[PDB]
Design a protein around this ligand. Sequence first.
Ligand code: C4K
Length: 203
Amino acid sequence: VETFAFQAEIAQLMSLIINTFYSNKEIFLRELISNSSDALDKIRYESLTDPSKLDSGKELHINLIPNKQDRTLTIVDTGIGMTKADLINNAKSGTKAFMEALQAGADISMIGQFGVGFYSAYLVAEKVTVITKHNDDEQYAWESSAGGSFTVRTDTGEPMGRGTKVILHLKEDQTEYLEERRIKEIVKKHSQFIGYPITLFVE
Ligand SMILES: Cc1cccc(Cc2n[nH]c3cc(O)c(C(=O)N(C)c4ccc5c(c4)OCO5)cc23)c1
């Protein structure tokens, strides 16, 4: 298990997201779905010149998996995935412009325009786990409960083939994001035009 410190600006952004009074928390789902869509675009693009890239999985989709027992909402995609280098690297410039925008009068819902939309996960989650598998690397698990650090480790769990899984360990008062009707309403409102199938799993 490797422990890393977040770069100062990211730690600051994460503190801002956790501490600011902001009721419109549902925006986290649109940000994660949009990141999944971008990774799916990357694998679809790379597969045109090289079809062997789809050997780790042909289907390009997004699955939303609520688990009331574990209090987790999982966003799974069969996108390009991330290598260990991509995982650790993937923000400093966007983070800076976003803080400045907020002070100027902008709101947390514009987070995606600065390429740091992922951190909106901390509006609803006390801990985020990211499992990823890229064709050029092994399966890795990234994890952070904020507090200025994150861990990275080789994942020993079930192989994914290719893609990224975001496991949101929800805060006690945010269990509405495990409800079928609530998830449906959010996806309809903010992610109506994603160019990939979004399957909401039922329990
Ligand atoms: C811990 C950690 C490290 C890095 C990035 C994230 C953000 C993230 N959230 N949900 C995702 C789903 C994905 O398929 C990917 C992914 O496989 N790719 C290649 C990806 C990379 C950057 C992106 C992106 C897609 O969308 C715009 O920014 C990432 C993310 C989280």
